[PDB]
Amino acid sequence: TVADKQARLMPLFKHLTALTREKLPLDQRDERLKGVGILPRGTLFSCFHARHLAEATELYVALYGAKDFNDFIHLCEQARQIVNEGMFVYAVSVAVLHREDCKGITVPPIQEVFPDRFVPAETINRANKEASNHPDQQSIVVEAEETGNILDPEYKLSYFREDIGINAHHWHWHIVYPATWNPTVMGKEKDRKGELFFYMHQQMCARYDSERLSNGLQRMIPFHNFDEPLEGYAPHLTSLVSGLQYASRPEGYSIHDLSDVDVQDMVRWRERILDAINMHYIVDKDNNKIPLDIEHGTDILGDIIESSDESKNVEYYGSLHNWGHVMMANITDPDHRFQENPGVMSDTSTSLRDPIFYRWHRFIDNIFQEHKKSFHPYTKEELSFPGVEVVGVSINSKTANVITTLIKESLLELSHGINFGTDQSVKVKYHHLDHEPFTYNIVVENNSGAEKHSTVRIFLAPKYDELNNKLEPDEQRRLFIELDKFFYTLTPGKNTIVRNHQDSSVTISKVRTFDQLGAGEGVSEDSTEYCSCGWPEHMLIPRGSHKGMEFELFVMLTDHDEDTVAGLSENAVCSDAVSYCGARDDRYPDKKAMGFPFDRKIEARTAAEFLTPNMGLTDIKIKFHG
Amino acid sequence: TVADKQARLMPLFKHLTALTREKLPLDQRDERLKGVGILPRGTLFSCFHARHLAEATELYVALYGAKDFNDFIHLCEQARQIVNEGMFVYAVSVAVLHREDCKGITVPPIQEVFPDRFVPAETINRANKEASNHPDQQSIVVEAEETGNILDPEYKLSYFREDIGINAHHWHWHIVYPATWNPTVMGKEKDRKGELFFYMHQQMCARYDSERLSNGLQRMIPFHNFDEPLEGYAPHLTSLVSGLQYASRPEGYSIHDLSDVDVQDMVRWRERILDAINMHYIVDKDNNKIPLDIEHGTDILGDIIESSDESKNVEYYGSLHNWGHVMMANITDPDHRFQENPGVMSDTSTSLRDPIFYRWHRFIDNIFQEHKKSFHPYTKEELSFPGVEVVGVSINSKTANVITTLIKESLLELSHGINFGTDQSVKVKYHHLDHEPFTYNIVVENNSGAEKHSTVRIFLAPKYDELNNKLEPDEQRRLFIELDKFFYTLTPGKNTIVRNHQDSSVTISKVRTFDQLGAGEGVSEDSTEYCSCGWPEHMLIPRGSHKGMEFELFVMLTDHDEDTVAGLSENAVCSDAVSYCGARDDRYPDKKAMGFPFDRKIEARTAAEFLTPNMGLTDIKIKFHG
Amino acid sequence: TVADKQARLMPLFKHLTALTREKLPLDQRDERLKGVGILPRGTLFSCFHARHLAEATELYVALYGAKDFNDFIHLCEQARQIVNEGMFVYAVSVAVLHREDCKGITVPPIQEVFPDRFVPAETINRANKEASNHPDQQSIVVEAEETGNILDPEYKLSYFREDIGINAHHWHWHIVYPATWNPTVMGKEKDRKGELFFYMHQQMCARYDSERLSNGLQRMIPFHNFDEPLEGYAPHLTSLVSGLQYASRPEGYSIHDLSDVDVQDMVRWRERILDAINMHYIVDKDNNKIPLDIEHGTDILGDIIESSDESKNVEYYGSLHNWGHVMMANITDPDHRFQENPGVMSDTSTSLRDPIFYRWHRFIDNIFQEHKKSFHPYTKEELSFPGVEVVGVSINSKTANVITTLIKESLLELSHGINFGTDQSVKVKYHHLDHEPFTYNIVVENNSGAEKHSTVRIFLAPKYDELNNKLEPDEQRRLFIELDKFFYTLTPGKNTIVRNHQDSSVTISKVRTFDQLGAGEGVSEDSTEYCSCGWPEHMLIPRGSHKGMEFELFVMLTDHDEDTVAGLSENAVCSDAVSYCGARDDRYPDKKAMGFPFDRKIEARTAAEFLTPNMGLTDIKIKFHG
């Protein structure tokens, strides 16, 4: 049964670190690999680096190739013995997500699988220590929160950057859309992966910026200049695999050439993207030019920038984004003479924690923005949905139009990830931001005679700037974060549409723990995205401040008939986030450009001026509770 | 497989009539149909009448609603027993075309399903007679051509009007774009259906006019005045399903009110429409005004005129086109006291045969024309594609620049449609117009440095008028028929583009027979046009005359980058026939107004004066072979 | 899904009577049947008659042949239109039971499908009348119990004979083991069907006899002599299909020749079976002799006697059992000049109600008994399980060692079976025998060192004869009824095994109503046997008397290792009765002859003398509550 299948998968995931000791007593046995097998076990796996990705792709293909599920388990079991463990988790998760046979199946928790990435070394040490200190079945609980002098104001952001859910999501997203993805081999293609790459990262930056403003900090600045020295960050993460840890970075470091590729190369590739934009056309390998067409243009750029296998030219264009992660990651030892491990930037699970991440991503986002700039703005025609008027919006909470945010304690179970020994469970306690539940009530007047179908789009943007209160829509575009997108039908006359925050399309409703999965539930059975992907729920709104920071609440209704050609496939099944995740093996359900109406330049000085009749702005307050 | 699915659907439709006998003892049993259960089995189904359309729509929805294909077959199986058969074929065909379970399921050929509509009564009852006369497995062949005194010159046109392919196409087209189509229910919308409605019918008229001229007859005149008496036409079609036949109409009696509608109302609807066109806006139900925009205007008008469900106002504007068919159809018994069946005008399969069809359609076309008139003409800017020059065009055939047309015999197999009994097959032999294959060679000079992409548009228009030789482009607009539209890439320097007639975008390459289908065919797993629509191939060019009538051959090249739309749709699907049919589940592939450059008024006295550098006219001859 | 599949099946079953009106307007259409199609719709279908069975078999094969489930539904839907309805239900049920595709699926209730067979004409008339009398949504309830003078003491037995559950079971059993069953065609074979045929019928007789004794009536006598006149029985059943009903029989009728086969033929076949027994060997068609081997011998006899398709010789041996039903059924009109319907004997659903059934079945049982007689008795060796001793047995109820039996009212919903019209539901109230729940506690001493596995067999036999109290084991063999058979493991030392009556292997735990089935439960999804087959639970013990009739309670433990070679396949899934039903697509799980230890002759004068150490008898009382 499916349940049995789930059980088999969980053990593929257990004791990965330990699973090593290849113990296939003749090297010749795998003639299948006679000139490959290159990255050893203990080594850190880089999600960004090309060579690592190539190996990973090779692994996935074998998994995809597996004739049946049983065969799948077998090769996996065997492969896991030899290959580097990180690569293995990566390859398997991709396989589980896509391979039909796996119509059954969650992947074990990333946080749970590698607890060391989620929690600090101190807590991990303590738990391990307590386990040894007194042998006893009794459970161990450790509170990760610590006590320290907080020198850097960046620390304030830690609730966002360090959040377990956020890191997990980032890991999962890359799994759903792998850079290595080869559509020919799989046969299936990932719709608009390049564009999604752009959108997801942009949102992370946008959301990040809202945190800084909530904090009273200015917006992050892009890492435009390669020459500038980076700010330092020390992760305090250990790798349980070994004694080694992610190397910390002090500040004052400009970016160094690596043996692999060099800063100059980064520049070239940047000059190179720009030409293609200016010339309205990119050079394929064939030396043909492809136009940066209206719908297409973001997607093509996304593939080139990341870059994915899909890039029209890898050799002229390179892989700017990925190399950025690699270069930043080994700033400490570009030479690798030190034989030190890379920083957090190397891994999709960890990278969000470093503040540098935002600087780089804003830089890349800028590239996309220049492209967007080339496009013409939106006419009333494009925006408006005639006959429909938005009367008002209200948010209901304990206090209307105010959302309250607080910190909540939570526990993570280490036992699946690290050797438990005698103890039944070792849990680490951490705290994260959370908010009260709320609902939206939108009153819409349907002037038309017949029932209409509308897509409701809701975004949140900060009211205040760093100078004073200024709702300049051009700037707002960067800041706006997507709360929700959903379909509703309106009858003629007045209508009130109520939606609850819980329903939000952006967030993952729930991630099942390896324990829940040990039994067998019925969200349904799809895969790596299942409970994993989606933005985390606690994260839905920015922290705000004790004072109650003012944010613009924007609701827009668009013609659904227009919006969805097709693409209302799987219902509330395993995964549940379309806004950032897309839909399983079906289209991202919306014709509009991701981020619409915000994606193109706004002529108006004030946001209010921008509004059409089917748009509305309600100012609400977010107040944090200490 | 999908082909096994074929083999079941075809015997579902095979012999419709005898699958009636509802045979469900309690009427209440099918609560599923408690809303309908109004039009009995034997009665003729009207494609035009509103009430009939409503029932049909209700049926389709159930079919669309069907959860899965198996469920689809079940409801269909049982529904067919109770509903009128004509309605049933209509509803099912629509379902097959749209519903995703059905790709690669062609329908049973209409001609084959209802042979009686395609062939004359004499060859229906002769064939039936032969079957009874001598029982024997042996095949029966009957030649439909007959022998008779040919009093009316209209008879000459019969090759065009009576053509099997033409009638079939008309049936199919209405299926792809149903008047009843409700986008909300389906969720998907038919792009530019109103405009397509206009374009397709206009082409039929235009093509018809070319036949008359080839014949030496004057162009058809519109049925502007409701008062005028109609010319008579006797179809000689029987409906085997019953004894009944389509009632013939003699000439010479003015128009009669039906219980359903009065002629005065028809006149009203016209003055209503004309006014709107005039003041440049139409009134919605909401009593808001929508402008007749250049982009939108034809589409909005098409919906109102037909009228479709899409019409912005049904209760003010009415349904002029459809009522026209109904009124003409029951001219013989407006009262229906006679209880006589309607004429050919009632059915999409038959309507083209009656000469009245053209008179009415020209009338409606006129309505569209007035709208077109309001639009400004095309500047050199719009027409020209700079840097591209058309040097010359040549048509290659047995004799260059001459196309030969002849009559070819063909056979139609009755057996699927009517009860065969003992005989293996009963075929009726008919003759149709056909032409020799030919190719076009266009020499184009690409002045630009880079490769360009062009859409080649080819049209044919008669050189001679009724008076004498006069290439007055204004008049030509009505006459021009579309030969082909395709994309080609031009390198710098001289280029020669060759295209074969077979490739023509206007025509259907092949219609598979029941026999072909039982054998089976295969495509991707989605839902599409059921190997259907597209103009018949033999029909591609007008008959011409033995003398070799002169026609202007017009070729124009336009910038493809401008012409195409960007978006993400399917694999190679039913796109052969894009010019008249559109593309399956796709937006119309050409930005230009349908019929461009011909749609707007032409200032010049002569066509030659109109030409820009990217246009060319070659005079060719069409000669018929007796 | 399975649920959807269930839904499709239920409608195959609805309005069967009505489903007629073939309405396939040309007879030639089904060339597949061009020389068959012989029994009209309205006619009564005989489960026994050979010609009817042949048609039924032909139908099933088509259903089995169906490529997929969807195809299955289609042919079924179409076939049901033409074929006689009774045959149809029979063929479909068989298909549902065996055909894998139907890994989904209960069959709609027999009682519910044909309520008229279960309830008396009066009640059915009343319900129908009430429906018409006052139209109203309101529910109708009718109490079937009636009021009448009860002339015949046979009436007392009516609770047993008339029981709804019993009749339903009999219907289902024949479906699981069809006489027509051809193993070559299906490919699969029904293990020991001939023997099971013998065992099931024998049990019905045995159980019947216990009722008579409980009643104070003597045991039924076999219908040995063909000459003797039969006792009359009037069923009072109507067939809703038509106005006709099962013809009643008065007494005083000796059995008449029918056109089909004659009494003399019955005798021949009887003389013929006997020879084969005496000669130790039966004549196959090949004229080879097959020995009436130890294990095999009952099975071979069963096939010949019934007779099934499996019979080694149909033409020498005939089909005695089946013809008996036919002959008795049309005693009233052997000639069929009267054109009267057959009696209850014709149908598996109805036959148990007639008292004649027992007389005939005892006669046939006698045939089997003679065969059993030829076998040698059981030695201590065969019976005993050494090292195991049964200390005692106790039955726990309200009062220990006493079981209480009462009458319970129940309602049956007619609506699925007969045209409901306006009413939501029409229920008929009936009463049936029922008993208090009880448990058994068996103390067993396991002398051996190791754990043993035992099969516990429990039987019940009447203590009293018609003369006075005499536990003569030879006679008891006929009377003993099987309460339960189950596997238990015994450790060394004393053990107490407790089993509840509810668990009984003989009975069906629950039959799901068409209403329950309208939703979707998880007993699992197997088929006609699902809730249907198994003996009914209320029926588990005989009525007993108010005085508290004494019955011997016999418990025996046997070596399980010995007992099951293989055959512990499907668990508590859809069907749940192994003792009488066998297991789905797996062996009847017991090596021992069915009815062991009772099947062979017992030398001893008293039952007690028979007991070995692993056997025990506890006398309990059954007392009925008025």
Cα separation, A423 vs A136, in Å, equals 6
Cα separation, C508 vs C511, in Å, equals 7
Q: CB under 8 Å to A153, separation ≥6 — which residues? A: A215, A217
Residues of C in contact with B4 (CB under 8 A): 67
C256 by DSSP, 3-state: which? coil
Query: What is the end-to-end Cα distance of chain C in Å, rounded?
Result: 48
Q: DSSP string of A460-473?
A: EEESB-SSSB---H
Residue to mutate among A384, A561, A569, with most B CBs inside 10 A, is A561
Q: DSSP string of C316-347?
A: HH--HHHHHHHHHHTSS-SS-SS-----GGG-
Phi, psi of B535 (to 5 degrees): -75, 145
Cα separation, B456 vs A594, in Å, equals 35
Cα separation, C262 vs C324, in Å, equals 10
Residue C612 CA: distances (Å) to CA of B462, C304, C461, C615: 112, 36, 18, 5
Q: For chain A, count helices (H), then strands (E).
A: 22, 14
A474 by DSSP, 3-state: which? helix
Give the residue from chain B lying closest to A489, CA to CA: B184
Under DSSP, the state recorded for B238 is B
Phi, psi of B480 (to 5 degrees): -60, 130
Task: For residue C329, give the amino acid letter.
Answer: A
Residues present in chain A in total: 626
Cα separation, C541 vs B268, in Å, equals 85
B81 neighbors B20 (Cβ within 8 angstroms): yes
Give the residue from chain C lying closest to B7, CA to CA: C71
Q: What CA dihedral angle connects C114, C118, C120 and C125, to 10 degrees?
A: -30
C298 by DSSP, 3-state: which? helix
Cα separation, C203 vs C195, in Å, equals 12
Cα separation, B126 vs B143, in Å, equals 10
Q: Do C77 and B77 touch (CB under 8 A)?
A: yes
Query: What is the end-to-end Cα distance of chain A in Å, rounded?
Result: 48
Cα separation, A426 vs A415, in Å, equals 6
Helical H segments across A291-442, by residue range: 296-306, 314-317, 320-329, 356-374, 380-383
Task: For residue B551, give the amino acid letter.
Answer: F
Cβ atoms < 10 Å from Cβ of A288: 12
Residue to mutate among C21, C415, C418, C420, with most B CBs inside 10 A, is C21
In DSSP terms, which residues pair with A469 in a beta bridge?
A464
Q: Per the structure block, which two tokens stand in for A489?
A: 């039908």
Sheet of C452-462: strand order equals C140-143, C426-435, C402-413, C615-624, C549-559, C452-462, C481-490
3-state secondary structure A573-597: CCCCCHHHHCECCECCCCCCCCCCC
Residue whose entry in the numeric block shows the structure tokens 């992907």: A533
Q: Do C29 and B15 touch (CB under 8 A)?
A: yes
C300 neighbors C194 (Cβ within 8 angstroms): yes
Task: For residue B4, give the amino acid letter.
Answer: D
C85 neighbors C55 (Cβ within 8 angstroms): no
A209 neighbors A362 (Cβ within 8 angstroms): no
Cα separation, B126 vs B139, in Å, equals 13
Residues of C in contact with B417 (CB under 8 A): none
A621 by DSSP, 3-state: which? strand
Residues of B in contact with A296 (CB under 8 A): 566
Task: For residue B143, give the amino acid letter.
Answer: E
Of C52, C49, C309, nearest to C183 by C-alpha is C309
Q: Per the structure block, which two tokens stand in for C245?
A: 């009903």
Residues of B in contact with A568 (CB under 8 A): 187
Of C80, C25, C83, nearest to C52 by C-alpha is C83
Residues of B in contact with C25 (CB under 8 A): 15, 17-21, 419
Helix (H) or strand (E) holding A59: helix A50-65
Residue whose entry in the numeric block shows the structure tokens 């799987």: A570
Cα separation, C561 vs C555, in Å, equals 18
- Kindly report whether the peptide bond that precedes residue B351 is cis, defined as omega within 30 degrees of 0: no
Under DSSP, the state recorded for C297 is H
Q: Do B288 and A451 touch (CB under 8 A)?
A: no
The whole-angstrom distance between C18's CA and the closest CA on chain B is: 5
Q: CB under 8 Å to C478, separation ≥6 — which residues? A: C205, C206, C209, C219
Q: DSSP string of C39-90?
A: S-SSSPP-SS-HHHHHHHHHHHHHHHH-SSHHHHHHHHHHHHHHS-HHHHHH
Q: Do B184 and A451 touch (CB under 8 A)?
A: yes
Cα separation, A260 vs A322, in Å, equals 12
Q: What CA dihedral angle connects B107, B110, B114 and B116, to 10 degrees?
A: -170
Task: For residue A211, give the amino acid letter.
Answer: E
- By CB atoms closer than 10 A (0-12, 13-18, 19+), residue B492 is middle
In DSSP terms, which residues pair with A553 in a beta bridge?
A460, A618
The whole-angstrom distance between A557's CA and the closest CA on chain B is: 16
Residues of B in contact with C8 (CB under 8 A): 70-71, 74
Cα separation, B308 vs B314, in Å, equals 9
Q: CB under 8 Å to B300, separation ≥6 — which residues? A: B194, B282, B290, B292, B312
Q: What angle do CA C420, C425, C429 make, to 5 degrees?
A: 115
A598 by DSSP, 3-state: which? coil
Beta-carbon contacts below 8 Å between B and C: 72
A485 neighbors A458 (Cβ within 8 angstroms): yes
Task: State whether the Cα torsion A293-A296-A302-A305 is positive or negative.
Answer: negative
Classify strands C388-396 and B481-490 as parallel, antiparallel or unpaired: unpaired
Cα separation, B16 vs B41, in Å, equals 10
Cα separation, B174 vs B177, in Å, equals 5
Question: Which residues of chain B are at the C interface, by a Cβ-Cβ cutoff of 8 Å?
Answer: 4, 8, 15, 17-26, 28-29, 67-71, 73-74, 77-78, 81, 419-421
Q: Do C18 and B25 touch (CB under 8 A)?
A: yes
Q: CB under 8 Å to C49, separation ≥6 — which residues? A: C260, C322, C326
C392 neighbors C616 (Cβ within 8 angstroms): yes
The whole-angstrom distance between B526's CA and the closest CA on chain A is: 11
Of A612, A618, A567, nearest to A591 by C-alpha is A567
- Kindly report whether the peptide bond that precedes residue B235 is cis, defined as omega within 30 degrees of 0: no
Q: Per the structure block, which two tokens stand in for A488?
A: 């509703």
Phi, psi of A486 (to 5 degrees): -155, 165
Under DSSP, the state recorded for B154 is G
Angle in degrees, 0-180, between the axes of helices B2-13 and B69-82, rounded to the nearest 10: 10
Q: Which residues of C131-154 are buried (b: 16+ CB within 10 A; e: fewer)?
A: beeeeeeeebebebeeeeeeeeeb
Angle in degrees, 0-180, between the axes of helices C69-82 and C2-13, rounded to the nearest 10: 10
B384 by DSSP, 3-state: which? coil
Q: Which residues of C sit in the known binding site for Cu cation? A: 170, 174, 201, 321, 325, 361
Q: Per the structure block, which two tokens stand in for B311?
A: 């019409």
The whole-angstrom distance between B345's CA and the closest CA on chain C is: 29
Cα separation, B448 vs B493, in Å, equals 8
Residue B141 CA: distances (Å) to CA of B108, B126, B131, B418, C28: 21, 10, 10, 14, 21
Q: DSSP string of A356-396?
A: HHHHHHHHHHHHHHHHHHHS----HHHH--TTEEEEEEEEE
Cα separation, B623 vs B625, in Å, equals 7
Cα separation, B426 vs B132, in Å, equals 12
Side-chain-facing half-sphere of C560: CA atoms under 13 Å: 15
Q: Where are the beta strands (DSSP E) in C421-522?
A: 426-435, 439-446, 452-462, 481-490, 493-500, 507-508
Cα separation, A328 vs A343, in Å, equals 8
Helix (H) or strand (E) holding B88: helix B85-98
The whole-angstrom distance between A568's CA and the closest CA on chain B is: 10
Query: How was this entry determined?
Result: cryo-EM
Of B580, B508, B571, nearest to B103 by C-alpha is B571
Cα separation, B134 vs B421, in Å, equals 11
Q: Per the structure block, which two tokens stand in for A598?
A: 């915000």
Q: What CA dihedral angle connects B465, B470, B473 and B477, to 10 degrees?
A: 10
Q: CB under 8 Å to C615, separation ≥6 — which residues? A: C383, C390, C554, C555, C556, C557, C597
Q: Per the structure block, which two tokens stand in for C396?
A: 């726990």
Q: Do C4 and B67 touch (CB under 8 A)?
A: yes
Q: Per the structure block, which two tokens stand in for A555?
A: 């609701």
Phi, psi of C81 (to 5 degrees): -65, -50
Spell out where chain B is interrupted, by the residue before each break (C to N > 2.5 A). Answer: none
User: Could you say which of B184, B189, B288 has the minimum Cβ distance to residue A447?
Assistant: B288
In DSSP terms, which residues pair with A497 in a beta bridge?
A442
Spell out where chain A is interrupted, by the residue before each break (C to N > 2.5 A). Answer: none
Angle in degrees, 0-180, between the axes of helices C320-329 and C296-306, rounded to the nearest 10: 30
- By CB atoms closer than 10 A (0-12, 13-18, 19+), residue C380 is exposed
Q: What's the longest Cα–Cα distance across chain B?
A: 78
Q: CB under 8 Å to B225, separation ≥6 — which residues? A: none
Helix (H) or strand (E) holding A97: helix A85-98
Catalytically annotated residue among C306, C310, C529, C537: C306
Residues of C in contact with B17 (CB under 8 A): 25
Sheet of A481-490: strand order equals A140-143, A426-435, A402-413, A615-624, A549-559, A452-462, A481-490
Side-chain-facing half-sphere of C169: CA atoms under 13 Å: 29
Side-chain-facing half-sphere of B622: CA atoms under 13 Å: 27
Q: Do B566 and A449 touch (CB under 8 A)?
A: no
Q: DSSP string of B439-491?
A: EEEEEEEE-SSS-EEEEEEEEEEESB-SSSB---HHHHHHH-EEEEEEEEEE-
C-alpha Rg value of chain B to the nearest Å: 24
Resolution (A): 6.8
- By CB atoms closer than 10 A (0-12, 13-18, 19+), residue C383 is middle
Q: CB under 8 Å to B445, separation ≥6 — which residues? A: B388, B389, B390, B391, B493, B494, B495
The whole-angstrom distance between B70's CA and the closest CA on chain C is: 6
C109 neighbors C515 (Cβ within 8 angstroms): no
Tell me whether residue B501 is annotated as binding. Answer: no
Q: CB under 8 Å to A351, separation ≥6 — which residues? A: A170, A325, A344, A345, A357
A508 by DSSP, 3-state: which? strand
Q: What angle do CA C555, C559, C561 make, to 5 degrees?
A: 145
Classify strands C140-143 and C426-435 as parallel, antiparallel or unpaired: parallel
Helix (H) or strand (E) holding C283: strand C281-283
C580 neighbors C536 (Cβ within 8 angstroms): no
Tell me whether residue B174 is annotated as binding. Answer: yes
Cα separation, A120 vs A238, in Å, equals 7
Helix (H) or strand (E) holding A458: strand A452-462
Phi, psi of B442 (to 5 degrees): -115, 130
Task: For residue A461, give the amino acid letter.
Answer: A
Catalytically annotated residue among A55, A162, A195, A306: A306
- Kindly report whether the peptide bond that precedes residue A597 is cis, defined as omega within 30 degrees of 0: yes
Phi and psi based region of residue B532 (left: phi greater than 0; alpha: psi -120 to 50; beta: remaining): beta
A103 neighbors A112 (Cβ within 8 angstroms): no
Cα separation, B121 vs B418, in Å, equals 13
Q: Per the structure block, which two tokens stand in for C6?
A: 């269930």
Q: CB under 8 Å to B215, separation ≥6 — which residues? A: B153, B156, B157, B543, B545
| A/B Cβ contact: 3+ pairs below 8 Å | yes
Q: Do C29 and B22 touch (CB under 8 A)?
A: no
- By CB atoms closer than 10 A (0-12, 13-18, 19+), residue A340 is middle
